[PDB]
Symmetry: D2
Subunit: 150 residues, 4 copies
């Protein structure tokens, strides 16, 4: 049914982004019931958000970069089951994990993930997702380092 | 150099989104010069934006859905070289193309693309991109229709 | 429940191989899962590959005459798609069955073949291989139109 | 300028085949570009494929003993990676060269092999095949750790 429709939409966006070299794609599907509206609105984006002049410094100050510094700033996963209801900071569930380096020198990046979903609804990130993300950034860290030293 | 670094970042985000079933991913790379800031911030997302109750009707009214209705509402590509400087509507370059149906029955969707880029900078969408997008949505339209009738 | 964990795994294996290929720049990836039931064997061997088969500059005239390029040849000269249900059972071209759908890629003006798209073994959710149907044929006919444009922009 | 349009094309061809595979659910895609220089031949044949090779339930014990599963076997029993520069030139395992990097996938606790990752033909920008180096080996060693977790979550 619509699960199949929601899968094509993903494919179409990823494909168009690949072939055209655009940052954003949105697929609007005319709602069959209300022709004025959209039954599905599938969105995707890819972007390098900083090509500036530390102007990048001041961008870190911003409220959506919060959790990133919090994790760079702890060396430890941050896990927020429902963000609307959360009381440590002034879009729903969020996992965010330090990308560390080769021989645990220090921290070289952060993975934020937003809205784990159900294979369904939006969901919290569990200890098992954490463990998976932790194993994932190991190779990432090692890939990121190669693209400079070489 | 950083072009290679900007490519890994894309791969990492697409991969993490694939494996974890999240909507948003952001890869922060600690700026080597200012440890407080981010040298790169690579962002990606995938989302179904409407699972509601036409509540979807009122969502069409919104200012970022503008151009979508404009194209549903014309049957013709819309092409805006620099949006900040544009005078037809109250993020920069934008192409937006109707997804039509099998035997040109009517319109079943819209592709918005934002920010063509250079293989470099952000760029306008040309007549050639249009022609390419026009040929692209033909198979899309035919794929979208299959996931309902079947 | 136990066929539900196996379709799962295939998905992961494909993701794995696609991910590693993309990151590593290799032509071929094969992931073997050791059979839990006895450790001397593999319960899954998931293969994926990616490569350009014509790295030679003529010497291609000879290669084009290979047995495995016949469908391609047939579609190119004929200028129309070819649909075979079971490549073995077929009589004009000299168990587990194989299905084939081969479609021409044309120039905008549709009077000349500029390439060909050959697809093998349409699949069902972990289902068997099946024949390509008319929607399949319809769909690919629409798909190669934008392929032609892509390709042509590239040969500038 | 004219080798610049050819690396371009390979990129498009890979994108095409990946796109069509993904949309169509087929195991194999081959895109042929008709040689502009003479229409009887193909100047590019870009192949990509995707499939599970063990669809049988024992009968796998026999399959695991195939010649093309030896590296896999060797890595699994040995429990450590295997790196071959030119699979032909190599003497323990019974031109255009082939390079091979095969790494074990382990359980969290690292005392048992649960699968194996075999990579073939590391490539250079349209460059030739080359040997896998130590970074290659380092990188894959880090990559399979998360593979193990993925796989295991799947076998619940």
């Amino acid at each position: 049914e619509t699960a199949s429709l929601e899968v094509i939409l993903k494919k179409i966006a990823a494909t168009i982004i690949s072939f055209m070299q655009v940052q954003k794609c949105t697929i609007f599907i005319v709602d069959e019931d209300c022709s004025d509206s959209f039954s599905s609105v599938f969105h995707m984006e890819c972007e390098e958000l900083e090509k500036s002049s530390d102007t990048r410094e001041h961008d870190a100050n911003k409220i959506n970069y919060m959790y990133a510094q919090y994790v760079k700033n702890t060396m430890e996963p941050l896990n927020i089951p429902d963000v609307s209801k959360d009381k440590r900071f002034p879009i729903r569930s969020l996992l965010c994990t330090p990308i560390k380096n080769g021989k645990k020198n220090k921290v070289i990046g952060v993975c934020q993930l937003v809205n784990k979903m159900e294979e369904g609804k939006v969901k919290p990130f569990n200890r098992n997702d954490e463990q998976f993300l932790e194993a994932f950034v190991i190779f990432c860290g090692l890939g990121i380092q190669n693209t400079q030293m070489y």
